[PDB]
Design a protein around this ligand. Structure first.
Ligand SMILES: CN(C)C(=O)c1ccc(F)cc1Br
Length: 284
């Protein structure tokens, strides 16, 4: 039995190394990573890899690892795949903990835009979780946390984190993580997977995929939203991605919205992530 070395970037930024038989399906590696993390609520998570176009792809647990990474290195990241609309309903604190780490990366990276005050508040819960109660000793007027809180740090933001941290005295890690999630889950881009596309007129848009449905970001003014109930069918052909929309009551015929993706692979990727979110957030 020939085994391949796999390297997985964990959500705390550490590296986990293991071996799988070279013909292993993605589920085999995923089960090994989840055991290492003591994670039971595995359905929300998945492994990503970077393709030869350098694009993030979900490792399909049902398919051979080798048929997906193809020519690439057996290097992966551990990520949230389905962001729970209501993290309070997850059964385990460790589940909420990994969701927090993913979200901290979403914020720092700028995938999850956040106001000043919400950056500082989220920051303040992370600090309470990780260091416990505010202590002036390791905090002077010039203090700067090791914690990355935002795409761009300012002294004002560091001060606001400390001010809000003072207010959380006695808060346990599980409690701070729950408060973090009750705030994060309300952000307009929470759990939104964005894909670059052009509309049928050739205008640059973003397609968002999330729990509740599809979002078409034309710009800040005029954002189309298709709840899953409204979506009849979605398809891809070549570089094209088409959304079939239900008729309104006493309308005879569905509407079709077509989009142009950068290439055939980007169309197929968007299609797969829509089907997966549609299945998940038709069962939840
Ligand atoms: C193949 N497939 C699952 C579809 O075309 C689809 C249909 C309805 C919907 F709400 C979302 C999707 Br995705």
């Amino acid at each position: 039995p020939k085994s391949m070395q796999c390297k997985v970037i964990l959500l705390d930024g550490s590296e986990y190394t293991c071996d799988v038989e070279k013909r292993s399906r993605g589920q085999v590696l995923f089960d090994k990573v989840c055991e290492h993390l003591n994670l039971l609520e595995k359905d929300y998570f998945g492994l990503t890899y970077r393709d030869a176009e350098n694009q993030k792809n979900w490792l399909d647990p049902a398919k051979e690892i080798k048929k997906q990474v193809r020519s690439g290195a057996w290097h992966f990241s551990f990520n949230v795949k389905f962001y729970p609309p209501d993290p309070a309903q997850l059964s385990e604190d460790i589940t909420r903990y990994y969701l927090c780490l993913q979200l901290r990366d979403d914020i720092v990276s700028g995938r999850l835009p956040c106001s000043f005050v919400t950056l500082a508040l989220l920051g303040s819960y992370t600090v309470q979780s990780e260091l416990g109660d505010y202590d002036p000793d390791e905090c002077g007027s010039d203090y700067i946390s090791e914690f990355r809180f935002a795409p761009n740090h300012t002294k004002e933001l560091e001060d606001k984190v400390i001010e809000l941290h003072k207010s959380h005295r006695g808060m346990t890690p599980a409690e701070a993580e729950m408060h973090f999630l009750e705030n994060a889950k309300k952000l307009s881009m929470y759990g939104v997977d964005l894909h670059h596309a052009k509309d049928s007129e050739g205008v640059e848009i973003m397609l968002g995929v999330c729990a509740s449905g599809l979002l078409i970001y034309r710009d800040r003014l005029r954002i189309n939203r298709f709840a899953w109930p409204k979506v009849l069918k979605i398809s891809y052909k070549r570089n094209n991605f088409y959304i079939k929309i239900r008729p309104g009551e006493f309308e005879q015929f569905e509407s079709t919205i077509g989009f142009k993706l950068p290439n055939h692979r980007a169309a197929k990727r968007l299609w797969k992530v829509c089907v997966e979110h549609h299945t998940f957030f038709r069962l939840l």
